[PDB]
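Please check this protein record:
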Amino acid sequence: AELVSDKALESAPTVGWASQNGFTTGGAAATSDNIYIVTNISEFTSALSAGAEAKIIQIKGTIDISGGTPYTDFADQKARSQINIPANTTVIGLGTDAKFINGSLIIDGTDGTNNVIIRNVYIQTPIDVEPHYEKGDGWNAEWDAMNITNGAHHVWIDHVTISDGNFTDDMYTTKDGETYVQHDGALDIKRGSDYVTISNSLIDQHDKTMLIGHDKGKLHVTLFNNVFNRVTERAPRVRYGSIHSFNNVFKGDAKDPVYRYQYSFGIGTSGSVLSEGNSFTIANLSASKACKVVKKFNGSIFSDNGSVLNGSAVDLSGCGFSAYTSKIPYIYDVQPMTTELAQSITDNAGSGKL
């Protein structure tokens, strides 16, 4: 159809892992017949059926993954809400109101999927209609907002917003004396996926958000100019993989009524994190308790240079970790974190901000 988005055919910035050992161009090589404008899930799956052929799919308005039909149970939700994005695909939202609800976008490398760009779209985390009761311990929600799985490499998430939105956790009901959790993870990157860049995005209002690894020598993820607002934990929590996080904004409250801030970085098995010029504005978090932003699990590699906590340069080098030593293969400009920069990144973060 018609190319209406000015930014649709641009590829990932040369900065980031998604541009290492190959560039991430999505469907920029698409022919005129592989340019779409989709308004619903049927039109969306039809355009995606173009397979591994370069495709540009422009999202107009709200895409209700459920197709206006509520999921009857787990089986129904499992069969209808998971939309696979194939190789060489660019999903770019039009305007400021392009969004997805009631489902998950899946980049599955089982068919060899790689070279995917998801941009300028709001993904409201799906609600699991039938959570499973865990071993005497609360309810377990099953669905993601976005999952990168099975060797899927070269993925660029830019100006995307992921949020609980219309249904935040303060609205959870309790069943059998336990909170009926219907939200899962926000973004999961696992199973040997690799070469990913997440930029100018916003994760707003969510609990367990970003889990990387779930491997040795894979999972390279770069994150810059993103905002993590009222996010309980994992921004991200990594294992078997190195992440490069610089010039991001984390805003929370260690005593928030709904998404009480726990930590941002989770250092797991063979996981490494290079943090630089990040802004941490966490209410109820004492300057002497700054190492709370980094939580160790089974990993040991963690380094931070130039990050701030509540407006003051913080020293997160004595938190109990070994230095990040591997080199970053690409050049990048880490800007000094100031009140001005943190505010500007907050203005720019998320969908509708292209």
